[PDB]
Amino acid sequence: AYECGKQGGGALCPNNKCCSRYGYCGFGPAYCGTGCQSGGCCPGKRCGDQANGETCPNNLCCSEDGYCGFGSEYCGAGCQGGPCRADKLCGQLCPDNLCCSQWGFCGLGVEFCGDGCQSGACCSMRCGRQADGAKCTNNYCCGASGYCGLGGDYCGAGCQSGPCT
Amino acid sequence: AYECGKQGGGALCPNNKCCSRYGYCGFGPAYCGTGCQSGGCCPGKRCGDQANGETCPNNLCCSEDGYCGFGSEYCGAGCQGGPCRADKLCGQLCPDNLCCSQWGFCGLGVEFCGDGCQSGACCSMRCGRQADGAKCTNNYCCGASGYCGLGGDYCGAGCQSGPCT
Ligand SMILES: CC(=O)N[C@H]1[C@H]([C@H](O)[C@H](O)CO)O[C@@](O)(C(=O)O)C[C@@H]1O
Ligand SMILES: CC(=O)N[C@H]1[C@H]([C@H](O)[C@H](O)CO)O[C@@](O)(C(=O)O)C[C@@H]1O
């Protein structure tokens, strides 16, 4: 019956809905207040240096203060995680499975994850006996067909390397 | 069993994991490719003026070309949705349940959702009998104790106004 959070297999709610302390999605104090697990918590969840390096759920920005939110106060000056307004360099894996482009910037979409993708959620990164025993980055699994990814198709039967089974 | 997407009650995957066409979380072509429902799809999901105004799942940015992603190309110049780098004015709701601050900026966190919050996922916007019949915004439900919100705690038993069930 649970929807989200520790009760719901780590799932997030859609459209910034807060995950209550009991693992259901909604807005208002019962969801976003004390115990809020993810979404638009109020106050924002603690993050970055102020929470042992934990990133914000739902790709919220981690403020200079170490709270999760959106707006200039969170994503602008002093932003330490999430979709900060500053370009994010990599080479230092991108946080939260963002793709490190060939040019060493973090992002998502084909410009980052496609041709030349170094690491993160790359579209099509080869591995295993199909790619000279090449290893996957980010501790992903090498699927039977020699593609890097996560989930049953890559970590399940036929898995060549990484955290198989 | 299912984790995400239509099959998983509209849940999102954590850490930008892609929701496959079958409603499971992962990375690689099976999850992020054709039929990808959310997360770091490759290519990014269509959005904005290229998807009938649909916003990106997981607070991804909608590029000027109508694809979901992160990075300068998506959040920077031409961004039409998500956590664009430009400040977003309001007064005129915010998208994706973002709070409209008393000053007329969209965001999340106390500076937006706290005192003076006009709309969206406000921390503690009073309503109903406790607020002299005041109505909630965003078609939220007024809970029994007179706070605006969504979910069973606000739209369920005791719901005063809004789309009670
Ligand atoms: C996919 C990627 O890395 N794109 C980055 C590009 C590339 O480095 C190209 O080399 C420059 O066009 O550089 C930027 O400064 C840019 O021009 O916007 C940031 C952008 O995120
Ligand atoms: C890409 C994807 O969603 N794969 C999932 C598959 C698909 O649902 C079936 O291949 C559809 O026929 O089912 C699993 O139980 C599996 O076989 O391990 C989980 C796995 O994550």
φ/ψ of residue A75, rounded to 5: -95, -20
Smallest Cα distance from B131 to chain A, Å: 15
As given in the structure block, the two tokens for residue A45 are: 């969840």
Chain B CB within 8 Å of residue A59 CB: yes
Q: Which one of B17, B113, B151 has the shortest CB-CB distance to A97?
A: B17
Smallest CA-to-CA distance from B141 within B156, B131, B130 is with: B156
Chain A CB within 8 Å of residue B68 CB: yes
Enter the DSSP assignment of A160. Answer: -
Cis preceding linkage at B163, omega within 30: no
Find chain B residues with C-beta within 8 A of A158's C-beta: none
Q: Which one of A30, A60, A154 has the shortest CB-CB distance to B26?
A: A154
DSSP per residue, A62-129: E-TTSBEEBSHHHHSTT--BSS-SS--B---PPGGG-EE-TTSBEEBSHHHHSTT--BSS-SS-B-BT
Q: Which ligand is nearest to the CA of A90?
A: 1
As given in the structure block, the two tokens for residue A61 are: 């920005």
| CA B32 / ligand 2 centre spacing (Å) | 13
Chain A CB within 8 Å of residue B25 CB: yes
Instruction: Please give, one letter per residue, the 3-state secondary structure of B93-160.
Output: CCHHHCEECCCCEEEECHHHHCCCCCECCCCCCECEHHHCCECCCCCCEECCCCEEEECHHHHCCCCC
Q: How far apart are CA A60 and CA B102, in angstroms?
A: 21
φ/ψ of residue B29, rounded to 5: -60, -35
The resolution in Å comes to 1.6
Mutate to test the pocket of ligand 2, among B6, B17, B24 (most ligand atoms within 8 A of CB): B24
Show me where the domains of chain A are located: 1-43, 44-86, 87-123, 124-165
Q: Which ligand is nearest to the CA of A108?
A: 1
* Token pair 């993160």: residue: A120
3-state helix, strand, coil in chain A (%, to 5): 20, 20, 60
Find chain A residues with C-beta within 8 A of B61's C-beta: 83
The answer to whether the beta carbons of residues B48 and B38 sit under 8 Å apart is no
Ligand 1, CB cutoff 6 Å, lining residues = A 87, 101, 103, 105, 107, 111-112; B 71-73
The answer to whether the beta carbons of residues B146 and A106 sit under 8 Å apart is no
| CA A152 / ligand 2 centre spacing (Å) | 6
- Cβ–Cβ of A43/B121 closer than 8 Å? no
Q: Cα angle vertex A120, ends A117, A121, to 5°?
A: 85
Q: Cα angle vertex B19, ends B13, B21, to 5°?
A: 155
